[PDB]
Amino acid sequence: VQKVMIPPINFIFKLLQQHTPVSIWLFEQTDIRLQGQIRGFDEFMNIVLDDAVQVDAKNNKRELGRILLKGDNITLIQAI
Amino acid sequence: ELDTSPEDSAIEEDPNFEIPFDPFFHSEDIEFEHTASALILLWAPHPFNKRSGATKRAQDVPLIKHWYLEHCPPNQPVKVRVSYQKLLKSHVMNKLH
Amino acid sequence: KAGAPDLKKYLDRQVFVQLNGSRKVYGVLRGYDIFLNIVLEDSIEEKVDGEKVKIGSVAIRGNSVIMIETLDK
Amino acid sequence: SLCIKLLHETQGHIVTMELENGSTYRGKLIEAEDNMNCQMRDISVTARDGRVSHLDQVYIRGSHIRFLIVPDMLRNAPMFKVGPGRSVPLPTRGRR
Amino acid sequence: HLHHGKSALLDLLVYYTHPDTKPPKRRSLRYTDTHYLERERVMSIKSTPLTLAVSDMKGKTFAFQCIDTPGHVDFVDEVAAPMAISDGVVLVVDVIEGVMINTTRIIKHAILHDMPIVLVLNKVDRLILELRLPPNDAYHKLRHVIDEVNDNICQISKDLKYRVSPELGNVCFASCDLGYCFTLSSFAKLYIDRHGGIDVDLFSKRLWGDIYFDSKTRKFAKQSLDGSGVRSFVHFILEPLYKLHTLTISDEAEKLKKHLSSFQIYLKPKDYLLDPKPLLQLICASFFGFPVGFVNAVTRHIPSPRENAARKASQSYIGPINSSIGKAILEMSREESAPLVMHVTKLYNTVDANNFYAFARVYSGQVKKGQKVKVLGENYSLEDEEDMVVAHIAEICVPCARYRLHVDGAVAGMLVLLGGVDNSISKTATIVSDNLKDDPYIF
Amino acid sequence: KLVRFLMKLTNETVSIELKNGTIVHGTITSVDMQMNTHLKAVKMTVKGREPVPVETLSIRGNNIRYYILPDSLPLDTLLID
Amino acid sequence: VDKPRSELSEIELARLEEYEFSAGPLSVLQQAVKNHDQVLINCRNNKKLLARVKAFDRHSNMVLENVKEMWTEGKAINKDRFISKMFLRGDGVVLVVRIPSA
Amino acid sequence: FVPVNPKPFLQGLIGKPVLVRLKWGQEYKGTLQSVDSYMNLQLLNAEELVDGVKTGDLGEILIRCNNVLWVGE
Amino acid sequence: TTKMVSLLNHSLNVTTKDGRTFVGQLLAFDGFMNLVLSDCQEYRHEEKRMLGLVILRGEFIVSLSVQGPPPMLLSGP
Amino acid sequence: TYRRWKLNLPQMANLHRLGYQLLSDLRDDNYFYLFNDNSFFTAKALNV
Ligand SMILES: Nc1nc2c(ncn2[C@@H]2O[C@H](COP(=O)(O)OP(=O)(O)OP(=O)(O)O)[C@@H](O)[C@H]2O)c(=O)[nH]1
């Protein structure tokens, strides 16, 4: 009847398989947020993004393409 | 009366629980070459269960004291029984004083 | 070496998380890691104004978690 | 670690800690870890400005602690010597 | 039961908290005997109390007020009387002998009085070095003993609250002669400290009955079809224990030296050239440190006096709970304004048989030396107001078996030795304060 | 490893600007491979504060911004292992 | 070299350590020391460092002699400061840029 | 359908022109030819694009690992 | 790190990352430079507050100094 | 001077085997129930 615990690494792995768009926050930059498709990650969860657009508080989207986001900055990972 | 055994309960959450390390002494075996003899010596009479001592003098080792500290063997003649008893009496007097 | 945080009592409960920079997120905890990386489902985000925007499934880095709070009596 | 041992000693008492924000927490410590992650109860939060709020159950991550005010009567807690391999300060009886 | 090792268990803690004490030449220390008669018969006859500070698995220090009871059948007075001012029972069972008649009696009387029980399976080393059972048969023997104890519990109350099982952290495996007393959690933590980060509770709850570990999948199975896996407890606990004992015993200096070097246990070269038994004691005291498993089990599964005040008041106290005295008992107030209520269930001889010490548990209030108290007998009531005796308090001590710690005053929730009030007390008595509200009731 | 260069040099006056911007000036007693530096008879100058001297003082390794070494040191020889 | 696995014993850790300066990003400090080139270094407090690098660490802990250090900040005024010798903790480094001597 | 991990992503990108972003607003352009395990990187003929404007040329650049925010193009 | 031991039971002032200063008697320290101070006073900005028994984080600590010395034959023929 | 000795495990086992005729085989001490020293002292005192 209990629900099985899911560790975060498997959560990101699942997101990788489902190709779910994500909304990545940042460590201190509150207003800048990044979105795109996740394409690869490591144990330190450096995130390799696809279709990375730099969305802002006023939705000032800017196309960044495929980028590597160093793990030190990701505060939150959103599912769509 | 337990509804679910603690065993099935323990397994049923995260059946894929994993631990990578091995027990502490893994390459060894629970019985070595000299284990049987070591256990035999562990429960031996006083001189033989030590491996370290202090080299008593030659005359300070009685070698047959346990023969008469125990009971007399049965079916012995009268004089032997009396000898057992008298040696025991001398030992008791020695210990009392 | 490292050590597993004690959070089994907080699993599958309405929990409130404070992040760095005065962030605040609701949700029910669904997992945790060695570095206190947590996973939330059906969570809700608060802003400074206070309007509640549903945020979704969430995987916060543990480095940013300030506190984890529950409200039940 | 002697400081972590004293923190564990605190468990069950009322300890005040302030985090990297500057807010101080007044409550009963119920759990502690080697990382100094703490669990608290009946907390009276005093923000940096001075506003007083109240919390019931918290799990403060240890990396964001500045210091703690341990109850005074713990100044007599024993500081055991720690050998090389031991990870907890306890009375010793073996070689070292 | 008799000679099952309950005094050796307390000697184990005393050896650690008192560095000056050393083992005797030809026998066990048997600290907390302190009677020339008991040292002659080599058995406990009186229930000597002992208060000392012990350390928890994580480092917290508790104040264990343990009372050592006799194991002989005839001396059950010394078990029942101190058990009325105690919060739980620590049951020591010899694994080789098993559950005996006195163990059964203690279990029945403890469950009958709603006392939590912590089980200690003593003399484990006899399974390895004396009976020479293989690890699997040893596991079966331990499990059979625990099942027998649980049966004796169930004969009184089938409640699931009273249940002893290692997976509940309620059972300690010990060898007080060799000097270790661990639980499932103490080995799970002992593994974890060495090998990194895995939750101790999740690991420890999977180290009991017929949960099987598969060495290739690294997962805990349930049945282990054919012989793919071996029982988790045997794989992770009993087999390492056997190998430790055998490495020490079997005269393998270099292998043991290397293995203890891996554990950062370093011995002087003369130490390997020791008698087998002190070598085992040294290895076990360096490998297993302070017996923190027993301390953690006792702290978790035996309520503190404040938490146990309600049960004590409901069971022992016979007056009305709604009164002022009853309320003072339930809150266990420590302030001076509170009524002083103490229960005396024992009297102890001085080092010369001249005067007695009253062994009391301060249920509420405060007591200072020189305080005026009125002593209530075993049958004092509204009909019989003539059993009260007004008496002073001469000296207050904290018992420590072979000595006493004198304290100017004592506080609620403490077990203290009272001097100066012994003349009117035969058997049991209740000591309340004179300047108190009317209608004092007895326990 | 190059921190060994720190403990090869000892007992000489050095000026340190710490991580907070403060400046200290004194002779080292001993420095650590883990970068804990011990200072004696030093000159404590807190940023935006009046300078104050103290007899002995120690820095945590993370707080060292840089050093100011004297010019009387055999730098070439001191760099060898 | 074919050992970036990051699970290595001491010998191969040292081997990768030397190879990293043999060819990796930190290699620039090697020939900067050998060729004695001007390098401009910026700290995290907006301070400028120009000097020769006599030696450097794997943590980029560099010893600098003959430093030309300028910091800017009333109206924006630029000021300089020359220190004969300094030890720099690699923690504060944001960037290094080499000025070729030739 | 083929996931590319960070280290493979950077080593399969050696010699290509990229725009690195720092934590603090500076973005640099150039070509990289050397990245080690700790992901601090070296550039050639790089220039400093403050606010997205080409002000000065720097040449070859050593960037410490932590200071970057992301890398792309 | 043998010098670190020599400051036990001394009175120390510790300047912190925040900018405050704690003065008190050192009871025990740690590898991460966690300091345990007894009868600790807080130097904010100077205002005096009694704190008591205080455990410092390692990161919080910037520098430390000592203000006070540690508190305190047979026969012949 | 011969004041302390230290023997191996094989050597002690061999000596135990070689002198097996002249040592007891009890290892229990419950054999001497009323036939131990203190019982003899008691019997001497009571004249039984
Ligand atoms: N082999 C072995 N012997 C033990 C162990 N623990 C205790 N003993 C021995 O058991 C005997 C009885 O020990 P005691 O401490 O007197 O036991 P007890 O429960 O106090 O006996 P009573 O006070 O009469 O109940 C002594 O010879 C102890 O040395 C053990 O773990 N292993």
Ligand SMILES: [Mg+2]
């Ligand atoms: Mg006893």
